[PDB]
C-alpha cells in the first residue's frame, strides 16, 4: 500500500439504481422478454448488493 511500489488503487462501489438497470440489460441481451417489462421497476424492486 506504500507508494513507489504500486501506481494505482481503483475502488468499486456496489451498483446504484441507474447502474443496476444497465447491468441487468446485459444479462437480458441473451434471453427472452415480453413487451411491457420495465427494467426500471425491476431495478427498484431489486435491492441487490452484487451485480
Amino acid at each position: 500500500l506504500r507508494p513507489g511500489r504500486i501506481d494505482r488503487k481503483i475502488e468499486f462501489p456496489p451498483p446504484s439504481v441507474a447502474a443496476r438497470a444497465e447491468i441487468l440489460r446485459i444479462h437480458s441481451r441473451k434471453m427472452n422478454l415480453t413487451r411491457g417489462i420495465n427494467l426500471r421497476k425491476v431495478a427498484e424492486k431489486m435491492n441487490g448488493c452484487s451485480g
Binding site: 441481451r29 441473451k30 434471453m31 422478454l33 415480453t34 413487451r35
Partner: protein, 405 residues
C-alpha cells in the same frame, strides 16, 4: 429514429389515388411540416419524383402540368431556407467533433462509435449511399456482434423508407449469419420483425406468418412502425396461411391481440373478418370483406400492391370452406347465405373452377353443385413430375457449361 417510419407512411398515401381527398390531404399536412422540422429535405427531392403522375405532378424539379391536385409536391423557398439553415449548423459541428474522436489515440472504442455518429446524420436525412459507406467502416473494424447486427438494421431500414426492396434484400441476408455468433435472443427477435417486413413486401405470406406471430409478443420498436400496425399485419397473414384450428389458437386466443383490443379503424375491421370465417357466418363475411379492402389493404404500403392477390384468395377461401364440408348444395341455398344473388354467385364460382382449389362441378338443370375430389395420391403425382422436369433442366445446363471447360 422515430420520425423516419411515420413520415413515410403518410407520404405514400400522398402518392395514392385510392385514398379519399380528405385523407390524402390530412396526410399531406403531416408530411410537409415534419420534413421542414427535422431536416428531411434531401429526401424531399426523392419524394417529388415518387408522386409523379399519380397525384402530384406540378414541380420545380419535375413535370410541369395542371393535373396535380397536390401542392405538397411543389417546392417552396421556405423549404430551401430550411435545407441550408439546418445543414450548415449541424454539419459544421458534427464533422470537427467526430474527427477528433478518431484522431485521438483510441481506435476500438472511440473511432468505431464516431462513424455511427456520422451515420445517424445521413440516416436522419435519408441519403442512402453515404450512410452505407460510413457504417461500412464501423463493421469492418472489429467490434461487439450485438453492435454489428444493430448498425446493419439501420441500413436495411433505409430501403424500407425508400420503398426499394432489392436494397433490403441485400442487407438482411448478411446479418442473418452473425446472429448465432453473438448468441443474442434479443436481437434474434429484432431480426425476426425486420425479416417479417421483407417477406411481406414481396409475395410470400408463408414466412411472413411464422415471424409475425413471434413479433406480437416481442419486439421493441426500433425505427419500425407501431405495434398497432404489426398486430393488424399478423391478422391478415393469419387467415391466409393457417387452417381453421390454427386460426383459432394463433390469432383469436392470442393474449397479445386480446390485450391490445381494437383501437384503430384497420384493426377493428380485420378482427371482425377472422371471427366470421371461424363462426360459419356467411352473411357478414361479404360486408366485412369490402370494409377490409378500404381500410386495411389500401392504407398499407405492402398489401396495397398485393391487394388484388389477397382479395381474390379470401373470396376463393370462403367458397372452399363450405364446399369442403358439403357434398351437395343448391345455387339458391348457397347464394342466400352469402347475401349475393344466384346469378352473381354462378359467375364467381365458374371463375375459380379452373384454378383447382374449389373442386366442384355445377349443374344448371337441377341447380345442384356436386363436389368432386380428385386430389389425393393423384395430386402429389402432378407436382413431382413438374418439379423434377425443372430439376433436369438445371442439371444439363450447369453441366454442359463446365464440360466445355
Amino acid at each position: 429514429r422515430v420520425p423516419n417510419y411515420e413520415v413515410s407512411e403518410k407520404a405514400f398515401l400522398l402518392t395514392q389515388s385510392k385514398v379519399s381527398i380528405e385523407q390524402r390531404k390530412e396526410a399531406a399536412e403531416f408530411v410537409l411540416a415534419k420534413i421542414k422540422e427535422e431536416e428531411m429535405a434531401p429526401y424531399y427531392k426523392y419524394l417529388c419524383e415518387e408522386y409523379l403522375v399519380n397525384n402530384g405532378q406540378s414541380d420545380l424539379e419535375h413535370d410541369e402540368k395542371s393535373d396535380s391536385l397536390n401542392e405538397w409536391i411543389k417546392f417552396d423557398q421556405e423549404l430551401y431556407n430550411e435545407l441550408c439553415k439546418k445543414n450548415e449548423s449541424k454539419i459544421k459541428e458534427l464533422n470537427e467533433k467526430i474527427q477528433k474522436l478518431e484522431e485521438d489515440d483510441e481506435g476500438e472504442l472511440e473511432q468505431a462509435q464516431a462513424w455511427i455518429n456520422l451515420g445517424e446524420y445521413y440516416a436522419q436525412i435519408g441519403d442512402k449511399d453515404n450512410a452505407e459507406k460510413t457504417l461500412g467502416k464501423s463493421l469492418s473494424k472489429a467490434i461487439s456482434t450485438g453492435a454489428k447486427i444493430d448498425v446493419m438494421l439501420t441500413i436495411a431500414r433505409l430501403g424500407f423508407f425508400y420503398n426499394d426492396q432489392l436494397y433490403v434484400k441485400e442487407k438482411l441476408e448478411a446479418v442473418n449469419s452473425m446472429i448465432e455468433k453473438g448468441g443474442d435472443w434479443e436481437r434474434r427477435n429484432r431480426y425476426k420483425t425486420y425479416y417479417g417486413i421483407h417477406c411481406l413486401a414481396v409475395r410470400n405470406f408463408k414466412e411472413a406468418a411464422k415471424l409475425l406471430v413471434d413479433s406480437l409478443a416481442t419486439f421493441t420498436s426500433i425505427e419500425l412502425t407501431s405495434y398497432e400496425s404489426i398486430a393488424t399485419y399478423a391478422s391478415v397473414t393469419g387467415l391466409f396461411t393457417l387452417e381453421r384450428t390454427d386460426l383459432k389458437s394463433k390469432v383469436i386466443d392470442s393474449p397479445e391481440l386480446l390485450s391490445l383490443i381494437s383501437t384503430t379503424a384497420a384493426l377493428q375491421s380485420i378482427s371482425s373478418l377472422t371471427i366470421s370465417l371461424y363462426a360459419s357466418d356467411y352473411a357478414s363475411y361479404f360486408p366485412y370483406l369490402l370494409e377490409t379492402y378500404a381500410n386495411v389493404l389500401i392504407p398499407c404500403k405492402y398489401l396495397n400492391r398485393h391487394a388484388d392477390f389477397f382479395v381474390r384468395e379470401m373470396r376463393r377461401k370462403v367458397y372452399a370452406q363450405l364446399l369442403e364440408s358439403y357434398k351437395t348444395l343448391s345455387l339458391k341455398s348457397m347464394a342466400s347465405a352469402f347475401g349475393v344473388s344466384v346469378a352473381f354467385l354462378d359467375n364467381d364460382l365458374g371463375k375459380f373452377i379452373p384454378n383447382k382449389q374449389l373442386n366442384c362441378v355445377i349443374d344448371r338443370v337441377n341447380g345442384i353443385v356436386e363436389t368432386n375430389r380428385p386430389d389425393n395420391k393423384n395430386a402429389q403425382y402432378h407436382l413431382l413430375v413438374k418439379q423434377g422436369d425443372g430439376l433436369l433442366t438445371k442439371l444439363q445446363k450447369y453441366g454442359a457449361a463446365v464440360r466445355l471447360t
